[PDB]
Design a protein around this ligand. Structure first.
Ligand SMILES: [Cl-]
Ligand SMILES: [Mn+2]
Length: 449
């Protein structure tokens, strides 16, 4: 089995990322922390505690630049911040790994844990999300797109109820189109039967170099003719989360699903990844006319946003949408650990629970990297091979991934060469980095048997 991508691997996107991107992220956190300091008094416990975090962040950023060895977490840090013990277990088995030379996957997870520790050490900042300012401003600028979808949903809803109420092969054909639509909207994160609509799908689907959406459509259609549970291992908040809720809402109203369970992160993570509280913030944002300026409540734009917001609450009340968090999602462990033999860090718990799912949707690049172990697979490698135990341990999984990392699998022969030639124009000498640009995407399915 190939090793994992490293921060030392010359000519890899991971090399650039570790050395360049991460120092910038820590800097942004310092600046955003400062930005937040402006809105509060310049003394007292909270301010001074901010000064301690700010300083330690500066030092931590410098650690990464200086390429120092990754230190274990102290027993005290573990207690105060409830750090999973998996980290120190990994470091023992990986002596003297430094930022300049360490497994990409680990050090990236490890980075956000170190940052979290800093905040949880200061009581007044334990619950503070240093990336919330960024999440919000990004979601606010998606105002146009949020409304468009809200309008699309309101006008589809009467029709969806009718399609579920009177279902036949005639209606299935229509639903398939909408299924691919909402899948792909969810995929790309941030009329339908006409030309422009058809021109749009074809353009999107062209950049989906592998597309197993039909198979997921089969598991659900089949299950509907047997209690249909769909799972979302989430990625980013804002519009991507909004898109995911739209997919869920579509599935629930059409009858393709009866309960959608969302799995979120339990700490500020990957800057913009979803936490439990990000769902409530989203709904509040929809209703906030200062955040999303759609005018007076009577406007069509306002009504649509309020409708969907109300649809979210209703689904939660009735138990059709449920959000969850688990420390496992924020550990370094890949999803080969979603197996019965991982009894230390909830891996076995989630696996047992994910077996009950008719379809588990893994969102985003990180989730894709954890599925494939972030390993240097030949890019033609079979999908079932790269996911390890997940191919057989009884989990039905669908991966909606925008390609943003060196890892890539399940490509047909020759396609890696073609796409590399295409991207060669944008990134000369590094055509292979096409799967790190986010321009292309893949949809991979596995029954679990
Ligand atoms: Cl703020
Ligand atoms: Mn993310």
């Amino acid at each position: 089995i190939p090793g994992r991508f490293m921060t030392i691997d010359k000519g890899t996107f991971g090399e650039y990322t570790a050395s360049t991107r991460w120092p910038i992220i820590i800097q942004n956190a310092i600046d955003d922390l400062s930005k937040h300091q402006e809105t509060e008094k310049s003394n007292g416990t909270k301010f001074e505690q901010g000064e301690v975090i700010k300083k330690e962040l500066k030092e931590f950023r410098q650690e990464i630049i200086d390429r120092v060895p990754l230190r274990p977490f102290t027993e005290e840090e573990i207690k105060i911040a409830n750090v999973p013990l998996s980290f120190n277990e990994y470091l023992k088995k990986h002596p003297e790994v430094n930022w300049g030379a360490v497994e990409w996957l680990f050090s990236e997870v490890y980075l956000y844990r170190r940052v979290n520790v800093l905040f949880q050490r200061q009581c007044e900042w334990a619950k503070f999300d240093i990336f919330n300012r960024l999440k919000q401003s990004t979601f606010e600028s998606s105002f146009y797109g949020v409304v468009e979808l809200a309008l699309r949903y309101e006008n589809l809803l009467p029709q969806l109820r009718e399609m579920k109420q009177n279902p036949g092969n005639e209606i299935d054909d229509i639903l398939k189109v909408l299924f691919k639509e909402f899948i792909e909207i969810s995929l790309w994160g941030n009329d339908i039967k006409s030309i422009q609509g058809a021109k749009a799908r074809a353009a999107s689907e062209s950049k989906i170099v592998v597309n197993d959406t039909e198979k997921a459509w089969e598991v659900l259609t089949k299950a509907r003719a047997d209690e249909i549970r769909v799972d979302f291992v989430l990625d980013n908040s804002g519009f991507e989360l909004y898109a995911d809720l739209m997919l869920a809402a579509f599935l629930l109203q059409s009858g393709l699903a009866t309960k959608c369970i969302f799995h979120a992160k339990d700490i500020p993570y990957m800057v913009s990844d979803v936490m439990l509280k990000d769902f409530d913030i989203l709904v509040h944002d929809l209703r906030d006319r200062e955040f999303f300026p759609s005018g007076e409540p009577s406007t069509k734009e306002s009504r649509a946003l309020d409708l969907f917001a109300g649809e979210m609450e209703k689904f939660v009340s009735s138990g059709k949408i449920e959000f969850r968090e688990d420390s496992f999602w924020t550990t370094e462990l890949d999803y080969w650990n979603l197996d019965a033999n991982e009894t230390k860090y909830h891996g076995s718990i989630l696996h047992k629970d994910l077996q009950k799912s008719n379809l588990v949707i893994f969102k985003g690049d990180l989730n894709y990297r954890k599925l494939t172990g972030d390993r240097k697979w030949p890019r033609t490698t079979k999908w079932e091979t790269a996911i390890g135990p997940l191919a057989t341990n009884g989990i039905t999984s669908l991966s909606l991934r925008t390609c943003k990392a060196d890892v890539q699998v399940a490509l047909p022969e020759g396609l890696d060469a073609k796409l590399s030639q295409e991207w060669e124009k944008e990134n000369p000498g590094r055509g292979s980095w096409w799967c790190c640009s986010g321009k292309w995407a893949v949809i991979c399915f596995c029954s679990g048997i």
